[model samples]
Target: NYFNTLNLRQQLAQLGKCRFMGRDEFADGASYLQGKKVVIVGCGAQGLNQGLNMRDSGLDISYALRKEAIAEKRASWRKATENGFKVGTYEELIPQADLVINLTPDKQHSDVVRTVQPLMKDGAALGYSHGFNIVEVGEQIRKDITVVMVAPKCPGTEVREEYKRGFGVPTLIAVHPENDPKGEGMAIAKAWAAATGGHRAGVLESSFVAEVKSDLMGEQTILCGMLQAGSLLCFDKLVEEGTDPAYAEKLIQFGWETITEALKQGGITLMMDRLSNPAKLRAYALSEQLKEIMAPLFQKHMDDIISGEFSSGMMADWANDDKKLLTWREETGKTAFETAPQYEGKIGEQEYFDKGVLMIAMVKAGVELAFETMVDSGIIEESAYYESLHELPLIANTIARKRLYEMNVVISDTAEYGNYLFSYACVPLLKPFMAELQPGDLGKAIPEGAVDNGQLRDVNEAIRSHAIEQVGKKLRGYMTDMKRIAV
Candidate 1:
């Protein structure tokens, strides 16, 4: 068979040996879950969606949520019961469950595991949507029980929606068997993935450590961290130079929303192809400076993540009642930046070039950070890179946001092209940056107060108080009014 000829690495890259078919495709040979009792612990959106989807796939689905959660999530509880799902307590469900899926939040997973471990039957399996608790936080299960994870890449709503559309969200599955004598762990995990329609999209096998560590690094450093910090810095720089804050904001939004799509439609080259020659040349000139400015910062952040300095602090924060986390959130929510800028506005041609240069720098840095971190982890190969780094920024976001605004109305081709060119020009810097990042130096740059959380809040206030924000706010109102009338 073709599958037998491929090495494990090559097989991990392949989509799937077979796609999803309805229950009718599960002949006696593949009937792993035909008679299994699957209990979904945690009736949040994921739990509800998974339970419902698995039931549709012919498994007997039962649900369990805390008594407090039932009241808090009345709608979910109602929906589950309405669909004829039997609601059981954790104590009641664990002993009877053939598979217990913990769909609770990342922080709650350890507690969930502790609660269910003692009660679960010897041969039962436990499942998770994320490897956070099991991988790094060091949660454990009974030796006799199988531990498997089947994490869909998207949100719960999308998972259900995709299954309804006769496909499934791309999923990653992994198994941990410390003491199982039967060696049925991988098969059972695959069975669950198959039942949830994960095979239709793709189900790549990965270890819990690889998935959680890579996921955390990407989320903190590139996806959330870079985007917010870069935008705020550009906004601050523009206003400091006496540019209209609203104008600066308009340019920022244009670059953020429009160029993002351009990058997706084409890789760095194609996005650059749409630019004017002058803009492209300017971007190339700026690339070296941007790389110098950003590479060390990127290296430092990556170090914190790989060294466990970041995760340990976050876990401690959660243990400390999420003190810093909540404070940061509260401060951010109260910032003027959260308020819409008052005017719909425009920046001068030169201003566009300035912001465009910085934006492209950030993109290049983010991609390099994500790509290097994952491949270096030895957990992900070139094929898995598409899912981890490439797809989200380079493909998914662009497609999702392409039509949200008529980008061309506010953005110029030169600006778009400059964005693309920077990406191309920065490629040479990646290798040097990667080499400079020594494993021994991890966390050296991330000591207490290395990057102030308050500075971001200050920048937020600065942008919010500017005339640009006022203009943006008014412009937003007008846009909303127009939208309402158009509807």
Candidate 2:
């Protein structure tokens, strides 16, 4: 009996899990649709991004908006038209639409759906990126249509960027089979997901309820709400402690960057291990204390989310025309925390050229120093040194042109991650020169005891010891037509 129960439990667990629908599953999905017109109802991030991808994937795409949005020819209206998608109002497009996706905010969903439903073509699929309103309102539509969801796992900008990179972020999909004459709603949904290139990353087949609840919980308890609350709280404390406001902002940024890249590279274990010993100890001690205090708050948020309490509150505010939200915004705008530095500005061509020259200078100095160490300090053998001496020009120019022509593209993630980590440690040294520096500004002083032989040696040692020089020498032998340059 015990053995049977255990085996059954394992089988049940396997059945309960959702499977990834990758390109293999959805490769032919696009074949299901031909010349069908899709109306993207909300030309916001998700809508526009996916719609553009769909257009590229060979589907006929259009955008629909409220007539009110037609004033001044609108933002999305202009973008859609400029991007060559015919943009029209729901009344103008819904009757002729093959697939009409609801990309309006959750608060607008029920009303938006209500307006669009009566006008939609009888057999066309009705789509959503979120299930909030469908689950909450339990709206009854015509029995002749299918309801589907294709939710991108990331935001619009990121999904679009990733798609443009010949890849895509993960996506979640679900189909309601309540009514369909063609019974191809799921096929169409998969095709739409594939069109956005998310099938390459993997489209996950899941339930509307699962996607909605988890998404809400993620927003409230972890990704959006918690991170913002925690960041703002930390900033408040830092400002109160009299830290330089700009430095305080950089503090938050570096912390965010470090943990993000750490988790991205190797997850939490590496994040902790990579921290300085004192920082690691402090993090452990502080995090333990925080868990107890934060746990109840997180639970409260989760409870509200699961119980539909949060959505109800949001709906109430929406009914009030966002009065509560606007008031909170207007009030919080006056807070001291709002004054924290979030600097941004355009770099003119002169500044850009100056910085580029400075970078070249730094590279030139680094090349000379590292090359000197390679020869004199025996980091490179005489024969290998001569071979490496020639290969440097082309490979250096190759990556240089690559970095400048269109930066970071065509580079592997491992090299990108290494580039960030390796360059980050040198920030402190440059900060001293950041201010009051002209294009030709030069430094002449070496402060007493500022840096000695050991520090200088370590700086020299770092570059000389890198395998790039020796390895490139070997690699470039097969890569011909790259001419030699002066040492």
Query: Which candidate gets the maximum TM-score versus the true structure?
Result: 1
Among all windows of 10 consecutive residues in model 1, the one with the lowest summed lDDT is 439-448
Cα lDDT for residue 363, candidate 1: 58
Clash pairs of candidate 2? none
The lDDT for every candidate, in the order shown, is 0.54, 0.51
Per-residue CA lDDT of candidate 2, range 1-487, in tens? Answer: 1112225444233223344543457758566666788888887767788888888878888899889887668887787778888888888999998898887766678788889989998888898887776654456657888888888765225578867777766677887545455787678889888888767665667655555544554433333232333334444445554555565444433333334333233323333344333333333333433444444444554455445666666667678876655554454344444455542433332222221222222322233333333333222332122212322222222222322111122221212222222222223323433333332321111122343556445534443344534443443332221112111
Q: What is candidate 2's CA lDDT for residue 277?
A: 36
Please report the candidate that would top lDDT against the real structure. 1
Number of backbone clashes in candidate 2: 0
Worst 10 residues of 2 by lDDT: 478-487
TM-scores across all candidates? 0.68, 0.65
The whole-model C-alpha lDDT of candidate 2 against the native structure comes to 0.51
Candidate 2 residues lying further than 4 Å off, grouped into runs, are 1-17, 177-182, 342-487
Reference-based lDDT, residue 38, model 1: 88
